[PDB]
Amino acid sequence: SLNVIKMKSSDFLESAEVSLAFHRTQGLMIMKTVYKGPIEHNEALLEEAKMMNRLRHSRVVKLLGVIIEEGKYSLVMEYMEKGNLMHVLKAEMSTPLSVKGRIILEIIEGMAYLHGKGVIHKDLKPENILVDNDFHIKIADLGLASFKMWSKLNNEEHNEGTLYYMAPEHLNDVNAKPTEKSDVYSFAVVLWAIFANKEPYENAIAEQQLIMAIKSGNRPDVDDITEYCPREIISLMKLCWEANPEARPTFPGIEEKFRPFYLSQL
Numbered sequence: 597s598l599n600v601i602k603m604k605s606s607d608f609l610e611s612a613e614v615s616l617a618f619h620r621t622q623g624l625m626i627m628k629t630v631y632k633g634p635i636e637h638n639e640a641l642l643e644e645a646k647m648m649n650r651l652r653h654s655r656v657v658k659l660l661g662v663i664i665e666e667g668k669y670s671l672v673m674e675y676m677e678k679g680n681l682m683h684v685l686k687a688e689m690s691t692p693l694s695v696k697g698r699i700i701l702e703i704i705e706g707m708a709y710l711h712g713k714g715v716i717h718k719d720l721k722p723e724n725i726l727v728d729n730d731f732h733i734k735i736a737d738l739g740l741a742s743f744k745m746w747s748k749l750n751n752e753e754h755n756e757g758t759l760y761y762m763a764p765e766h767l768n769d770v771n772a773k774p775t776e777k778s779d780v781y782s783f784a785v786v787l788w789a790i791f792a793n794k795e796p797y798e799n800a801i802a803e804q805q806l807i808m809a810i811k812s813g814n815r816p817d818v819d820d821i822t823e824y825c826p827r828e829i830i831s832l833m834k835l836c837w838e839a840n841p842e843a844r845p846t847f848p849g850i851e852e853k854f855r856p857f858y859l860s861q862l
């Protein structure tokens with residue numbers, strides 16, 4: 597029903613390198629230029645952008661517009677001042693448990709909305725969770741995982757990746773189709789990183805050792821969390837990173853249990 601704002605490069609002053617760009621009348625926006633080079637896709641690209649523009653939720657980043665010009669293709673989206681979740685977590689100012697709990701609930705809210713719309717994120721990770729100045733979050737798709745046409749354009753010939761959060765069924769198996777349960781596993785490791793204030797598996801020596809470990813049941817070190825972590829969140833963590841994908845809960849199921857716990861205890 598709603599339409600995509602078709603933007604031009606002229607209404608942007610300059611973009612400083614994913615890049616921050618100032619719109620002459622609308623201010624700061626994040627611009628992801630996808631293609632630069634030598635037209636048949638301009639239709640499937642804008643139709644995909646119209647399909648993605650429908651997703652509107654307070655915890656999902658808004659696609660503000662698209663730039664479709666000759667040999668120039670970009671996506672324009674909201675600007676979040678504080679960066680991604682890992683950048684905020686590694687800052688020296690400690691984030692209280694009330695804010696961390698609020699962030700978790702908002703991640704659950706945004707994930708349940710995307711799944712309810714049939715969208716599987718496939719790349720949920722702290723780099724894809726952007727934070728504003730009020731410590732509110734919004735889920736992004738900076739890798740263009742769900743943008744099928746725009747990712748095809750990104751990987752085209754004439755156009756001039758962590759594993760910590762991938763479900764084990766996708767490690768060493770590119771032919772496995774990601775499901776909603778794959779996003780639930782990613783959420784589990786994001787939960788751990790929120791309380792550990794860092795990335796997991798710091799003591800890993802080699803990528804092949806890490807892959808074999810996770811596939812055999814190895815998980816982020818819970819004892820490595822020095823911060824206080826509620827018993828219920830550790831239980832939610834271990835439930836969401838179960839080896840069997842059918843044992844992992846759904847985000848509406850996570851939402852039903854976590855919201856009363858957050859309101860009453862956090």
Ligand SMILES: COC(=O)c1ccn(Cc2c(Cl)cccc2Cl)n1
Nearest residue numbers: 648657659671673735736737738742
């Ligand atoms: C393209 O740049 C982005 O990061 C971006 C723009 C809009 N969204 C939200 C979104 C998500 Cl999170 C997952 C799947 C589809 C959509 Cl539309 N992400």
